[PDB]
Ligand binder design. Structure first.
Ligand SMILES: Cc1cc2nc3c(=O)[nH]c(=O)nc-3n(C[C@H](O)[C@H](O)[C@H](O)COP(=O)(O)OP(=O)(O)OC[C@H]3O[C@@H](n4cnc5c(N)ncnc54)[C@H](O)[C@@H]3O)c2cc1C
Ligand SMILES: Cc1cc2nc3c(=O)[nH]c(=O)nc-3n(C[C@H](O)[C@H](O)[C@H](O)COP(=O)(O)OP(=O)(O)OC[C@H]3O[C@@H](n4cnc5c(N)ncnc54)[C@H](O)[C@@H]3O)c2cc1C
Lengths: 391, 391
């Protein structure tokens, strides 16, 4: 079989790039290891930047978002008995963030592709990439026991952190930057009305807590746990008690608990690879980088890689300007690094680290005191949160 | 579930280490991505060193080998109309090589384990390794849709070149050495009596050719092909014509052709990672390194990693001397590098490289002339072929 752009992975990056490309007339096939069911089961992201909201409109998959998505004009940080709100709207010059689940964005894109008639192969086993540096690269996979070959011009690895793409580039060609945090995030999705109309990030001596939502009747809560924790050691009862314990009394007493729909632990890490391409292979999304969930930048950074990749591929096909693909990595990394720095900053100020000395604890407290108390301090959190401008 | 040593991969390395360990009283589980059928379908290796022959006896799986295996006392190299034999026996001090297929060695080990009652999980999907640097690491997998957890003390990645193990070690911790040759090997297995009682490696202007065997009525032939070749572009007819064309007339006219049982193309490469371990994770076999098939050192290097790993684990469990595991990589790499140098040497003297100048072509010819003409020259090929001593 022959396509123009072979896309590995059908999570938001692949689906979004597939839809952007198909709409512009560039044929593409998407190969996915799993079933549509498993992809749709991943809870993940809740906060979207206006950059992605616009790219979804541009890809024509925004009807449902514009109806169900909640537009948030502020966030709240809690520490040392105080609850400080950051007015994103005022401090960033009118930009905001939209809360709409990744499971939804992924569902909408899946349906759109399903209707478009563009090719998608779920349960595509043992994907191997070939002749990446050639003029004609190919992808091979197994469907029902028979090994097929797919020919294409370019390949886009949108296969997440554990994908085959990044592994297909010679090690000596990539330089890895990584940091693994000594903790994880225990999340819990409940069919209960959220404790606030805005998100409440919270620093507390027992550890970090986050009050988020999916809609007016669906919530998503998180608490920091050691990497040694097993999710089956955390009953619903225990999660509510622990969450309540880390939030301000006024917030803790308005909390409406309930059984969990989903409950899982996600480890925190920062990871960046340089460069993000190799021959006819361009990495996008988690395949190329991971950011701690603290700053809500993962899905949003994928959106920008995918926007930059699509626009360059348009020039390549539509205008024959294929030499611009060489700049993919350069453009992307400038944005990736700044979002990596924020996610790192946020993580370090909101979390309790093991074996922190008196001086560090104090500096962590003063950071929040300064930033949340200064107009210029607040403006730096706001512009970074709403999302730094796309290049 | 809880085991002592969790082994990822059930190719020869895993099976051999599982059997060596089980026999010494150390419990082990083997997780395999594929079906026993697929593993048994891989044709691969034909030549075994006396080191592995002995380790198989030590693991008690040699009845069939000692009956079906062919003990070879010499090999033959052909170039510039000459056919020079290397007497391995005389030149190495009495050592020899045994020809017995990998499919057989793998079959024998599979049956032995099957009888022993030791645990084996075929079709073990999405294996992820965890807490490698902890005191208690674990492996998670999916069997029939349900994700299980396996606890263990140590883990041995015997999952080949495309395994999850090597990918589980932080990139910044590993230094990769790699070389990809501009050609591959087109093999063809036929149920025909071999053209000679010994192997004939051959340098010819059209490219490399190798005359090998599995038994007196089963043969395995190879010819060098560009990486651009598709196996479906090579009919049986075409392979025989091409093989005949690269061999000495006297050898070419005694050839008994026939239809192919198996026919596939394998790309050539050299690959070494340093170090070969990380915390409670030790790499063995192809997971840690690849050698061009030219020198018949791949399976044999795996045998030595597995022998060194087992012996160190005996001291660790049996004698409580767990500090010796720190030397695993040091010991292994000394052997790996020398076998890598030979496989590289062999490859460079027997193959036709694209864009080779007059001087290089001549030096390639003189290398064969010198080595095959000098007593000291021949002795260097012989001692390396039969296998350099285990440390
Ligand atoms: C708890 C949590 C909260 C988060 N919150 C936010 C938030 O509020 N806002 C935000 O911006 N970010 C957030 N993030 C990040 C975001 O979820 C990810 O960056 C995003 O899902 C990555 O998109 P992706 O499409 O690149 O990869 P993925 O989502 O990883 O999907 C990749 C696909 O590749 C497929 N695949 C893998 N290997 C293969 C193979 N070999 N063959 C074929 N296909 C293969 C997989 O099965 C998977 O379907 C959060 C993350 C977590 C864990
Ligand atoms: C054409 C050819 C000829 C050769 N000839 C010779 C010869 O004559 N003599 C010699 O010494 N060498 C030779 N070699 C080399 C030899 O075949 C290999 O070195 C050897 O097979 C490697 O053994 P292994 O057990 O480490 O890995 P493998 O043989 O690669 O088996 C590894 C197993 O790991 C499993 N696996 C992979 N990933 C996972 C996952 N994620 N979960 C679970 N399991 C997983 C795989 O499905 C596979 O079953 C030859 C190679 C080739 C290609």
């Amino acid at each position: 079989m022959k396509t123009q752009v072979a896309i590995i992975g059908a999570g938001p990056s692949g689906l979004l790039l597939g839809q952007l490309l198909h709409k512009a007339g560039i044929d593409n096939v998407i190969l996915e290891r799993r079933t549509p069911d498993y992809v749709l089961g991943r809870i993940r992201a809740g906060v979207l930047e206006q950059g992605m909201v616009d790219l979804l409109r541009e890809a024509g998959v925004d009807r449902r978002m514009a109806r169900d998505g909640l537009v948030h004009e502020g966030v709240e940080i809690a520490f040392a008995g105080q609850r400080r709100r950051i007015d994103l709207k005022r401090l960033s010059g009118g930009k905001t963030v939209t809360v709409y689940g990744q499971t939804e964005v992924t569902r909408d894109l899946m349906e759109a592709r399903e209707a478009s008639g563009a090719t998608t192969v779920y349960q595509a086993a043992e994907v191997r990439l070939h002749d990446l540096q050639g003029e004609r690269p190919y992808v091979t996979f197994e469907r029902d026991g028979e090994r097929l070959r797919l020919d294409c011009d370019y390949i886009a690895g949108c296969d997440g952190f554990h994908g085959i793409s990044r592994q297909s580039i010679p090690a000596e060609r990539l330089k890895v930057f990584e940091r693994v945090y000594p903790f994880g995030w225990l999340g819990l999705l409940a069919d209960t009305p959220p404790v606030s109309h805005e998100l409440i990030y919270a620093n507390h001596p027992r550890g970090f807590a986050l009050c988020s939502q999916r809609s007016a009747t669906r919530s998503r809560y998180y608490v920091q746990v050691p990497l040694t924790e097993k999710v089956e050691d955390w009953s619903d009862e225990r999660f509510w008690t622990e969450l309540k314990a880390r939030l301000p009394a006024e917030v803790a007493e308005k909390l409406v608990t309930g059984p969990s729909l989903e409950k899982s632990i996600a480890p925190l890490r920062s990871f960046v690879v340089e460069p993000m391409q190799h021959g006819r292979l361009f990495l996008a999304g988690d395949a190329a980088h991971i950011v701690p969930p603290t700053g809500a930048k993962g899905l949003n950074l994928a959106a920008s890689d995918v926007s930059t990749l699509y626009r360059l591929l348009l020039k390549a096909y539509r205008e024959g300007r294929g030499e611009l693909l060489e700049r993919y990595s350069a453009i992307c990394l400038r944005r990736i690094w700044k979002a990596e720095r924020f996610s790192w900053w946020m993580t370090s100020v909101l979390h309790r680290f093991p074996d922190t000395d008196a001086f560090s604890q104090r500096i962590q407290q003063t950071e929040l005191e300064y930033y949340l108390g200064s107009e210029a301090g607040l403006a730096t959190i706001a512009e970074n949160y709403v999302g730094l401008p796309y290049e």
